[PDB]
Amino acid sequence: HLIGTSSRAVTCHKPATVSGGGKSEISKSISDAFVFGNAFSHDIDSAMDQVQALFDTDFTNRFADASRNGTDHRPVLSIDRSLGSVIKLLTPSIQYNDEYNAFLEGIEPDVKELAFTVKRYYLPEWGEDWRSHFTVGIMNGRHGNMVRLDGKKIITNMLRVGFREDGSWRLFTLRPDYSPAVKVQTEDDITASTVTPPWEDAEGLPRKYVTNCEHLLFQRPDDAIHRGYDKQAEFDLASGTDTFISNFEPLTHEQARDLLTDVQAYSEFTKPVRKLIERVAAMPDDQSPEFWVCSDDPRHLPDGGRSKNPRYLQVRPTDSNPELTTVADVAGKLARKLP
Amino acid sequence: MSVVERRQINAAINLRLSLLGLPHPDSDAILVEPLLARQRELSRRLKDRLSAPDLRIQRFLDDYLADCDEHPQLPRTTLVLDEPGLARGLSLPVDGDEFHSDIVASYRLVNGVLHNPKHDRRTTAGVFHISTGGLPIPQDKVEVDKNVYARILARAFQAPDEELALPYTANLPEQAHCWASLLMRPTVLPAVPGRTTEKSYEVHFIVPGGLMCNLDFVEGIFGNAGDPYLPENDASLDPDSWTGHTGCVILAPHLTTMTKKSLGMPHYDDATERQRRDGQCWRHEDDLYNDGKAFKVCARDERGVIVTVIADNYFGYCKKEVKTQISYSANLLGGAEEEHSGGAEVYPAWNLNQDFTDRTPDDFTLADVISTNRELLDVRPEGYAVYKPEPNIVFIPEHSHYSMRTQTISWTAHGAEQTIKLLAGKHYLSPDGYRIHAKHREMDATQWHLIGTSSRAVTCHKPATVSGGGKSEISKSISDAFVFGNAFSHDIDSAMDQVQALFDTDFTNRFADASRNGTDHRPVLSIDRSLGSVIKLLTPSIQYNDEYNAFLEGIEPDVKELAFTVKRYYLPEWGEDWRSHFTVGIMNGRHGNMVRLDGKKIITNMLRVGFREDGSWRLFTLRPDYSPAVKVQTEDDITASTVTPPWEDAEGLPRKYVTNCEHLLFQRPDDAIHRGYDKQAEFDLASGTDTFISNFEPLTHEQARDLLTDVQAYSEFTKPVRKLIERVAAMPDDQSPEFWVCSDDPRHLPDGGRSKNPRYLQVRPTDSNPELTTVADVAGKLARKLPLAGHAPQPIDVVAAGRRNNPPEDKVPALCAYNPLHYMELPELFMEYISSMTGKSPSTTGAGSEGALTKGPFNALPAVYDLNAAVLSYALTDYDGWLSSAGYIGPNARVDHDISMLIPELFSHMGPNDRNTKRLISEGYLEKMQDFDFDGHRVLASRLGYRINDRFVTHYFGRIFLHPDVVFSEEMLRPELQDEKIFADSIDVIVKTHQRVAQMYFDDGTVSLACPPIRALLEIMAHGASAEGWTLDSPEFRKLFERESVLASDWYAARLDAKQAEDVKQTEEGVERLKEYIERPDSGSVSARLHLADRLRELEAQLTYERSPEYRRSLVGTLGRQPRFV
Ligand SMILES: [Mg+2]
Ligand SMILES: [Mg+2]
């Protein structure tokens, strides 16, 4: 699919944030927080009948301003109607009548989600027949509930917003047209800033401009002890050769050869760490370096546990990914008619 | 291949072209030149001297064609391909990557070599021509006059220059024109210890240089026998491994422009009805031979020399001709068969979850395994051993404990508990061969479990299977067919409440044998109770009592599956709070329905069994403990087999032993055009660099770069093809090879479409995964208490022929009366084998026929030879004839090959007694097909034999599927419920085809050669009754097929008398051959090197034994030899 990225940056500043308030999280991409589910329907044929009736609805007289009614005649599956257009069309709005907003409230959330799904995947090659591409599977002769597109299950994107009291996740579906925002990190821990009138207009509203005083970030991969979870730290710690690492346990060649055949723990690491364990395990005992660090083994404390403050100097995201940084700079300059 | 290997082949090629005086590239030479000048001069003094194999061929032609206008003489000077690889290097220009002639387009590829012949497809209509003057000609073949054959064979050696041009020199200032020859030794009789020596016949391919790619093709399949001029390669000087038979194949596409008139064939007015039927006559003087269509002409008789000329270069003709000549040698040799079959040694496997304790019987100990093969074992101090020829095989003491959680194997030895690490990639063999290995799931590399594979092979054999009947699927692994779904629950709380109630059930008083009650007190979630135990615990069984099986039948299917899921994933760490570990997701504030283990969705294994009428897949859940059976492929297309008393017991019931005559498999990846679908083909076509590929489109570097940037198509390929496209895209324009082949782009046809016959030569699975083949052989020998070193063949266990079915269409006949699995007694089985009906090419009377045992187009001999030996291989062995269904079950239940994949898994989970058809019938698992009236006409449905019922499905498919009672609907088990008319029409088509095929045996008179069983069957098929008035129901007719009848018969002893007489004749000929050769004065040097002195004494010892009545008694239980060929 296509991703559209606005060139209009909304630069966010997260100051004066206590420990555990989420200072570094503001520049961390939300794509890794994605949870993937499927679409479930207790009765797909009764659901597609309401979707078909919803498609056959005359949406032209929906606006609160009378001058706007009778101007938009695009059907829902029209090529001239984007996926976002259909989402706004079926969302109660101030611009819509009470006649229409009351009608929108009466649509089942199961039906609204299926209507968006048909819109997302409709191909004009299908013509009038779109129901034949949306079925439910039959398992052991019994009808299933997971909606399928040409046999294949439909995959939905979700994010967690808090936990229930019983500990289970509160998952919520993202809009079909939502895509993770692109973040260009500008600050992490030590920030130098200034306030001036805007550099492009001395008579404008003053602004704050910041830079990062640090060229390497002193990261604490707390949850890297859970193999496969902290993907970034696992890549940072395994794929480098000059990484400054602190509060980790020094591991030996034989320890890497033992972990290589620890099939459970080995299969849980992300691919960068699995590669690192392979390379170390293949080293003869006379080949240097003598030690290596694994992302899931912090420094063993003499008491018995392990250090809760593992650390390493991380290359800044804008330097490890200079291309996307250039794209944002070029795009942001076009947005402001700047050379 | 490496650049070094390619320069060595080119160097060997240059030496041989220089010996023949032919032009060759100019690229130490001072060193070999005096040797070359010497060998040339020795060669011109002996010029036009024929090698020993060519002498047996030429002497045959000179005598067989003694009364003809022409007396064809073989090419006296040829380019002899005495080493493997030469034909590969010669089939492409030395300096270029592309070659074009009027018959082939050849390309050097990144992933191998590509050869597109003039015709992309094989045909059968009027293709097999047999010369008169030899053995009888079947009714379906084209009859060619002996004189016309001589004129054809004479013109076959008059080849034009363009056809003689080697591809090796196509870009050189001067080209090399020559004939090329390749000697091969294809297997005809397999080796069975103490029973038969592996015997092969000898074939000599003699083709013009422009057909070099055909020599590379057959050399890869059947091997290279070397320089035929050397005594080491003379089949007659080692007669114990020779069948006494010689084949010859000439390829001459230029024969397609012969006129019938120039060949002296009669005009249509002067020709007989057989000649008019066969096109062996002309009308206009411009009429081409065989009306321009492809053809091969063939001459052979009882002497054992078959000479075939093929006028088409499509590679299928070459391998099928070798198959024909192997079948020709088998019928003339006796005691052997050539089968159009696939097969595999199938070892059943189970998912053993996390913990398993070894259960080795008392007659199997590691102490005995060590002392029997201690020169092969490195005994470790902890008390286990490692197989030194393959260190990944590890022999574990009996009664050991396997744990996946702690990842250990523990036992007691040397008065101490021993613990070793359970490694992934090792094969832990119990003293009886039972294998434990660690594996992670396909959809979750972090989910690990133990796999247990039985060392007790159920060796499956799939013969007489028409095209589309699933012949190759018998050996394909069912792993890639797995469909993965999730666990579903309408209400997980109420379901877990019923599961907890189920766990707190008193299960100890469950048995029908009341003395077995009160003995098992293990809870459901006990460590001492296995996952399979819980499944057997909740599965209705005849071992349980009436009240308990009713209690089980009252368990809802969801609760039963959830109970198994709780048992599958339960951990003793959880204690008694297992409920909290199973929940459903809350999405948008609404409770979901996917059962989740600690938050993660549970993944379930499923298989498709057919399609609904709307096209949707019929998915069915597998038992948690089901794992795909291990399949060691043994056959595919060309099978040499024999029937002897078991090699471990001369008094035992005779068995069949098979081997594959092919070493590369000529695969046709039909569905490779659907990217990602055919994972095996896509891996084979992309991961290689030496693959022989045919009927694919040659692709350029630029086309790889365009495909690399086509995100949709590129992402749909499997990773191997994606990696190949990446590599070719990175290639500059100055880097060779210039071409490559993509698995989804077959050869583009001149008429717009693409070829439907894409082909490549596949390395056999037993050769591409040699470690697993070693594992099965070691495990199988331990299961039989045999030493690890030595040939230990496994007999066939199950014979499950496949059958293609189809619903009726406007011109296609109804062939859809069979249900998933039929059992046929010998009479009904051989009406199927004789007919081999298929909906493809349906004639005017019913349906089409592939001939007897599907060898119709691959048999130069009367089919009745095969039928006599085939009927004996079932009567002498008590082999049951099974018949699986493919394509359709009735007119409306399409199943494709879903059931073909299920048959090996089904039988592998059935023991010997389970598969015994006499108790299956008497216990109500097999229903006899009954005749019925329809529109006043009696529908003879009884010819279909027996079919499985739902009791068979519930009991034996219940060992694979979680809910077996729903895998097959009633319309699928009793297909007449779909449409009675279409069912009656199918039987009518079957009965009418039985008539047409059996009648051919009367038109050509070969029915007079049939044994009494086969003879009366043909009379019944063709006329409605035998000469004695017998129908299929008559007890006198059916008793002819019983074992005690054939053993006590005179026609069987006559086959055993003929067998002993022919073996004595071959040996005494081999004795006179060696005596003569050693008594030559100049042959003393080779007698010392080849140990011909010892070999002659072995022959004379073999001759005395073959003459004794002791050898005649050992022949009882074998197929014998055809007593008369006319
Ligand atoms: Mg700080
Ligand atoms: Mg075949």
Question: What's this entry about, in short?
Answer:
This is part of a larger assembly, with two copies of chain A. With 339 residues, chain A is an alpha+beta fold. Helix content of chain A is 27%, strand content 18%.
What does this structure look like?
The structure is cut from a larger assembly and holds two copies of chain A. Chain A is an alpha+beta fold and 339 residues long. The first copy, chain A, has helices at 44-55, 83-89, 98-105, 109-121, 231-238, 253-260, 263-268, 271-281, 317-320, 322-335; strands spanning 35-38, 134-139, 142-149, 152-153, 155-163, 169-173, 191-196, 207-212, 216-219, 245-246, 251-252, 291-292, 311-315. Chain A contains ten helices and 13 strands. In chain A, strand 2 (134-139) and strand 3 (142-149) form a beta hairpin. Chain A is globular and about 80 Å long. Chain A has a three-stranded antiparallel β-sheet, with no helix packed on it. The longest helix of chain A has 14 residues, at 322-335. The relative contact order of chain A is 0.12. Strand 6 of chain A pairs parallel with strand 27 of chain B. Bound molecules: magnesium ion (2 copies).
